[PDB]
C-alpha cells in the first residue's frame, strides 16, 4: 500500500515519480537520500526506509533506487511484487536500465505508470498487454486483460509453430573450508520460448518421481523436485489434482516450471586450493581442480575464481590446463578454461611477492567460486516425456528444448 512510487538516481535526483494515493507528500523523497547515507555509514541501511510515520521502501536498481513511499501498514510483499513487475516491464520496453532511457521515454513512461496501478492497487502487469495498449511510438484496452486468459493473447498467427525450450540447471555447492559441502542444492529451470499460431494449451509431461509413483512407474530415473513453481499460465488445479501440467503457453519466452531440490551427489568439479603464503615474503597458490562430471560432458567457459591477496603484486602462474589471468579490479585470479572435459585434472601453482609493510586491517577470506557451464548434461536425470500441444484449429507442432547445466552458487570456503 505504497502512497507513491518514484524512480530515483545515483546522485539522489528523482528520474520520475507518480503519486497513487496522495497521502504522502512528494517532499519526503528528499529526506530519503540523507537517511540512506546515514544508514550506509552506520550499517543500518535497509531497502525499506522509514521517514517518521511514512515508510519509503526502496529497491536498488541498475542506476537509480526505486523508492516506493508508503504511509499505512501496506502489504510489503505486494509492494515488492509490484516493483518487480514494474522493473520487468521497463526491461522489456527499454533494453537499457540507466538514466539514458529514463529521460528519453517520459511521455510513454507516464502513461505506463498511470495504467499500471491506480490508488496503490496494481491493475496491469502483462508486458505484452501493456505494449498492446501503451506504446512509445491509443486504441481501446485489449480484451485479453478483461478475459480470463491474460497470459495467452488470442488471434496470434505464425507461419510455423516452433517452441524453443531451455532445461537450465543451476549447480550450487557450498563447500566449507574443512572440505565438506554444506549447501548442495540444484534448482531446475524449465523455460520455453513458444512461438506458434493461436493460443495452444501446453500439456507438460516429464519423468517426475511423483507422477511415476502415481502412475505405478516409480522404478526408473524420476526427478524428485523438492520445490516446483508453476508459471502464471500453468493451472494449479490440475497439478494439485493429478499433477497435470495443463496451461496456455505464453507468446514468447516464459518460465513454465522451476524445479528446486537438494543435491546429494558429488560436485561436478572438485577444486583443491593450497595457500603457501609466506610472512610478507611470497604467496603460493596450489590450486588443483578435478572434474567429477562425466567424461562425455565438457564444461564450456569454466572460470574458477581464486581470490588472490589484496596487496599482492608481481604474481607468477604455473598451471597446466587453462589460462590464468589476474584482474586488479577483482583482486583475484580466475582460472579461465575454454573447454573442460569431464574427468580433467588441472593443476596450478601461483607465486607472487608481497609488500614489506603489513596491512593495517584485515580483508577477509572471500569464498572461491567457479563459473563452469557444461551444456547437454542432465545431472538430475529428469527426462521430459511429452508436451501436449493442442489447438482448436489443429496444427502439427515441432517443439524443441535443450538441457543446459551451469554453476550457480558453487562457492568453496577458503582455508
Amino acid at each position: 500500500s505504497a502512497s507513491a512510487v518514484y524512480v530515483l538516481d545515483l546522485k539522489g535526483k528523482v528520474l520520475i515519480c507518480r503519486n497513487y494515493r496522495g497521502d504522502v507528500d512528494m517532499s519526503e523523497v528528499e529526506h530519503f537520500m540523507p537517511i540512506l547515507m546515514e544508514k550506509e555509514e552506520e550499517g543500518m541501511l535497509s531497502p525499506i526506509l522509514a521517514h517518521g510515520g511514512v515508510r519509503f521502501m526502496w529497491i536498488k536498481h541498475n542506476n537509480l533506487y526505486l523508492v516506493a513511499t508508503s504511509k499505512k501498514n501496506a502489504c510489503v510483499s505486494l509492494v515488492f511484487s509490484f516493483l518487480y513487475k514494474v522493473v520487468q516491464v521497463f526491461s522489456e520496453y527499454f533494453k537499457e536500465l540507466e538514466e539514458e532511457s529514463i529521460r528519453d521515454n517520459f511521455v510513454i513512461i507516464y502513461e505506463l505508470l498511470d495504467e499500471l496501478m491506480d490508488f496503490g492497487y496494481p491493475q496491469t502487469t502483462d508486458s505484452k498487454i501493456l505494449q498492446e495498449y501503451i506504446t512509445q511510438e491509443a486504441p481501446r484496452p485489449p480484451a485479453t486483460v478483461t478475459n480470463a486468459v491474460s497470459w495467452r493473447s488470442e488471434g496470434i498467427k505464425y507461419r510455423k509453430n516452433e517452441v524453443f525450450l531451455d532445461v537450465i540447471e543451476a549447480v550450487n555447492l557450498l563447500v566449507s573450508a574443512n572440505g565438506n559441502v554444506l549447501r548442495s542444492e540444484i534448482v531446475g529451470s524449465i523455460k520455453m520460448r513458444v512461438f506458434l499460431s493461436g493460443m495452444p494449451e501446453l500439456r507438460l509431461g516429464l519423468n517426475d518421481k511423483v507422477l511415476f509413483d502415481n502412475t505405478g512407474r516409480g522404478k526408473s530415473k524420476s526427478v524428485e523436485l523438492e520445490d516446483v513453481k508453476f508459471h502464471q499460465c500453468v493451472r494449479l488445479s490440475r497439478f494439485e489434482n493429478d499433477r497435470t501440467i495443463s496451461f496456455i503457453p505464453p507468446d514468447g519466452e516464459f518460465e513454465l516450471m522451476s524445479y528446486r531440490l537438494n543435491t546429494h551427489v558429488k560436485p561436478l568439479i572438485w577444486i583443491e586450493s593450497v595457500i603457501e603464503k609466506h610472512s610478507h615474503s611470497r604467496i603460493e597458490y596450489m590450486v588443483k581442480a578435478k572434474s567429477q562430471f562425466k567424461r562425455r560432458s565438457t564444461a564450456n567457459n569454466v572460470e574458477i575464481h581464486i581470490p588472490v591477496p589484496n596487496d599482492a603484486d608481481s604474481p607468477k602462474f604455473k598451471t597446466t590446463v587453462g589460462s590464468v589471468k589476474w584482474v586488479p579490479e577483482n583482486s583475484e585470479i580466475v582460472w579461465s578454461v575454454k573447454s573442460f572435459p569431464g574427468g580433467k585434472e588441472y593443476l596450478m601453482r601461483a607465486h607472487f611477492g608481497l609488500p614489506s609493510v603489513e596491512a593495517e586491517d584485515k580483508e577477509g577470506k572471500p569464498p572461491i567460486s567457479v563459473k563452469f557451464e557444461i551444456p547437454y548434461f542432465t545431472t538430475s536425470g529428469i527426462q521430459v516425456r511429452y508436451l501436449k500441444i493442442i489447438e482448436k484449429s489443429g496444427y502439427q507442432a515441432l517443439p524443441w528444448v535443450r538441457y543446459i547445466t551451469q554453476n550457480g552458487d558453487y562457492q568453496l570456503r577458503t582455508q
Binding site: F164, L165, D166, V167, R203, G205, T215, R217, N300, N301, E373, P375, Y376, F377, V384, R385, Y386, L387, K388, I389, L398, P399, W400, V401, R402, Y403, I404, T405, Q406
Partner: peptide
C-alpha cells in the same frame, strides 16, 4: 549449433501410459 546443449525434439505425451 548452440552452446549449452543442442535443441532436441519433444514428444506430445507418455505413449506408454495409455
Amino acid at each position: 549449433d548452440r552452446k549449452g546443449g543442442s535443441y532436441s525434439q519433444a514428444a506430445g505425451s507418455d505413449s506408454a501410459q495409455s
